[PDB]
Amino acid sequence: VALREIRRFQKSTELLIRKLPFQRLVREIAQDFKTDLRFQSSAIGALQESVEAYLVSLFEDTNLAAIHAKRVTIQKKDIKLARRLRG
Amino acid sequence: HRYKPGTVALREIRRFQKSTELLIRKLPFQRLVREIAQDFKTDLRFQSSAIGALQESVEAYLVSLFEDTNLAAIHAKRVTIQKKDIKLARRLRG
Amino acid sequence: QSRSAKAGLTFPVGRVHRLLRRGNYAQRIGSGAPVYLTAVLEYLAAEILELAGNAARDNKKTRIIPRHLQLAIRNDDELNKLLGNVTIAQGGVLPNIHQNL
Amino acid sequence: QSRSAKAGLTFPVGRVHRLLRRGNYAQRIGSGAPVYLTAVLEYLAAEILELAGNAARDNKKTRIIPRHLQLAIRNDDELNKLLGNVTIAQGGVLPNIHQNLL
Amino acid sequence: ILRDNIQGITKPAIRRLARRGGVKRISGLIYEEVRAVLKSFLESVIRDSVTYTEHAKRKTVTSLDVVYALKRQGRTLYGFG
Amino acid sequence: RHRKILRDNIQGITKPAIRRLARRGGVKRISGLIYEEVRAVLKSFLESVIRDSVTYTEHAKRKTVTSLDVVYALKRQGRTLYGFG
Amino acid sequence: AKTLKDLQGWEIITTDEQGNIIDGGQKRLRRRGAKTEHYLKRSSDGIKLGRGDSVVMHNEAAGTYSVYMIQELRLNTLNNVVELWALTYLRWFNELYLTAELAELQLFNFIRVANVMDGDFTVRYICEPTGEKFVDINIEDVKAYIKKVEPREAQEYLKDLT
Amino acid sequence: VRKETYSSYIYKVLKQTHPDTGISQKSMSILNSFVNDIFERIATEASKLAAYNKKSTISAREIQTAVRLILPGELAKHAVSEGTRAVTKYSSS
Amino acid sequence: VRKETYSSYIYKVLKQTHPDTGISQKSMSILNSFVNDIFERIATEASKLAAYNKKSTISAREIQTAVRLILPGELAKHAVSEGTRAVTKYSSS
DNA sequence: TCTGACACGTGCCTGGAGACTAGGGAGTAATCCCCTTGGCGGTTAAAACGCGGGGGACAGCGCGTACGTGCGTTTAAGCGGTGCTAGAGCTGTCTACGACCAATTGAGCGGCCTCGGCACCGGGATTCTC
DNA sequence: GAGAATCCCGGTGCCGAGGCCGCTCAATTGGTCGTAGACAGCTCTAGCACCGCTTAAACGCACGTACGCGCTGTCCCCCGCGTTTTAACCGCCAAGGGGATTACTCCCTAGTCTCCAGGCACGTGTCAGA
């Protein structure tokens, strides 16, 4: 199913990270500064899209690293390199 | 006696890593820069300060790239780098 | 008859001129500078719309969608460098398959 | 006296104000902006010079050559993040060896 | 009051993101690490946007300050600012 | 005049120069498939930076490139240098 | 030429592949296949300046006329509206030598086209600025090559010849 | 109210070559943001470059330099070729 | 002639806490360029941030927010702690 | 074969042109210097070349813990409908704040000594490999 | 079973910096005209929050198998040592490309009335999707 999912997802457009968990996570990560902070509805979507783009880029980078490493399985060390290879 | 391969390398690494002198030769680097700029247009005036700035920037960029490639190689259970490591380093920063 | 019509550019000249002067970018902006900027922006827009239409015609669609825009901007290699550090919203990703899968 | 002594610092508020005015940055500049900017710049300069002096004391040297300055700019873990992609002339490389090299 | 919700982004979501990335096989040890990745990135962006909003004399974080913070970090976003 | 030309000086950054650069990088050994591609990477980086600096210096009716414009060009690319500009 | 005043006697003709059209010059569409060329001709007689021809120009300081074979031209630059990169000919001071150096040619230094060929003059061999290393190589064999491909591969090719 | 956008002229030039096709509302915002960002980048680069040469008058040459630095590849050589098409049509007319 | 630099002030603040350790001219140029770069970054960030909210002037809070944006980590919390202190006794003097 | 969004006439008011003074700046045409290539001769820190060698890259394997696919059951989600109140964005004050006009004075970078800190020596120890 | 890659006693060259001089130039005082936003009010609006009806998907349980890191063999190839070699830099000659500042003047234009203009708040007649 994964092989079909490859070009099912690269052709798809709908977002993957669900809006409600993302909203709650943003609320909890923002309350650590001030109590009762407000966010716009479109701001949440924009931030989620940015997170999507960043994570997709990171996963493409770790896929490149893995296929360079003569393997198809990514691990924590691969993402640690991804941080430590480009910053 | 003759040292086995892999012991002079390490003190060599420290002895070029603690200091910060210019290793890339100034005159060949200036000639290369002038000839590269000639591909854009001829009769261009270069001063020593600009050549030094370019050499320092190239030095820093290449040291950073080589450190990145060394990290990539040691991540892959390897101690040497090949063209694949350089390509991986280049594609992930620009 | 208008300033934009004098140079034959669809994009505005007075609007960009006032946005430059009220934009806190420079106290002094030239006369040929706004028209040159208008011309270069019009050419860039024409090129990007050409690429978007070429991409859309291959998907049998008569409308410009962010997916088509991202596909067009990613296929173009010199335009990709300028649009390297951007995130297109609702545009998906560029399909690509390596030689090790 | 000048405002630099009035604020109790050693950096020129007047110089930064004049060159902000001549830098084509803003039509109007507030009264507290130059003094606040002078304060933050003086704090950054004091921090970097203190770090450079601490690095120099470790090497038993008095003159600050760019080596100790690079050590200061990279050793501090939040201050180095600001200069993430900077190039320092005749700065050198951090003294470290990964355990997977020996 | 609201806690133990960092696990809102669950492991099938990471699996789907990996499939979009272009991989076939992924280990299960990367889920906590990618959760930390998301936490750190979102903390930085949220701090930038909150500073923007505090300067702007607002309390409702709109899309504009988020896009401006993204632009300041070299991650400019289009269609929202 | 201009009665001087260099034929393919791409190897000006010589082999042990690359060796010592890698040694500062912190490597143990370098394969033979590096010395031919690192020079190409350096050539591309120079073709970018020197072109930007040439545009900077010839914008202001000048044919002599200074260090200030080089520093500004590196700053525009996110690789700024301090103390030369 | 510098400003448009010095180039008021020239026009622009855009040869996409082999045409003599104007079309304004890169009007709205740009895509793969951008090997189009832009050339200019004076209205006094109607002679075109193609990419690969040869002209003769006088030096402000040297004074002696020299033949330059045009290798490339770039339009709408910073200092000059058109910049012409050519290969200088090493004068003996009627056999002409050839050099691989690139030089800038100015508009007002052009008086008449020099259609030299292997034997209004004749060439002997390609030479070097050092004063030696002359190889009996003509120009008609490389004009078509430099006209058919991009200028880049043209300078790698001419470097490989020497 | 009081919203200055480039939608009308971009749409008109959209029917300048292919009037058969249209544009969605979401992609139009993407294009507007992109053109605004690139215009801001060009203006900032031109102002910064002018301030470096003791220059306070931004003219056509400063914008040309900023755009050619920002625009990469031979495409820039094309785009600049368009710019001088306008000023020549402006000074003459 | 008229070589702009910050050497005297940096040296004076150096003798404020480290009277014994000197500094070289080559390193002094490095510090001068560092100060100029930090200043330019803060100023351009403040100007862009003012342009975001249709602001017309740059006040103390503008640069405070700019340095909060640029300066990362706990050091930033210290910098403002040193900044707003001075103004606290600057206006009341 | 049925839909929810997308696009042409539609007015005026904030904005784009129309047009007359005086700030005010640049490529023309000028001084003498500000750095710099070309090369003159030697050499010494490296750069090439040959050759021996040992750590390491390449390739098959079968153990072996680890995961995607197949599969219940919740479980939080996907959307429709409101009650509602904190707040972003609306005009108006007027009072605090910027540029600039006369006018003045301390300063910090052009030059010049007067010391001031480091390298390299004759010549010991320092932790390196086997 | 023992060498160097330097440490540190200590003098001096030797380039480099800290006082010493010193003087045009911008910092300082502050009405005045312009100007811009903290209050002052408001206003409408949109998502918090709740409630409810449906509903795609996660949490593991089981299992075959692609996969990964250590084993073991094979070769391989780049580095260290010895010999050759090769041109950069020293220290200048030396005029030449090009720059430190007037200047100007005349046209580019800020300001300001001034006259006009165009496109967005709508909107019902069409068109990609299921």
Numbering used by the authors:
A (entry chain E): 46 to 132
B (entry chain A): 39 to 132
C (entry chain C): 16 to 116
D (entry chain G): 16 to 117
E (entry chain F): 21 to 101
F (entry chain B): 17 to 101
G (entry chain K): 2 to 94, 130 to 155, 170 to 212
H (entry chain D), I (entry chain H): 35 to 127
From the paper:
Orc1, the largest subunit of ORC, is responsible for Sir1 recruitment via direct interaction through its Bromo Adjacent Homology (BAH) domain. In addition to its role in binding Sir1, Orc1^BAH^ has also been shown to bind the nucleosome. Orc1^BAH^ was previously shown to interact with the nucleosome core particle (NCP) in a manner dependent on acetylation of its N-terminus. Here we show that nucleosome impedes Sir1 binding by Orc1^BAH^, indicating the need of a suitable chromatin environment for Sir1 recruitment in yeast cells.
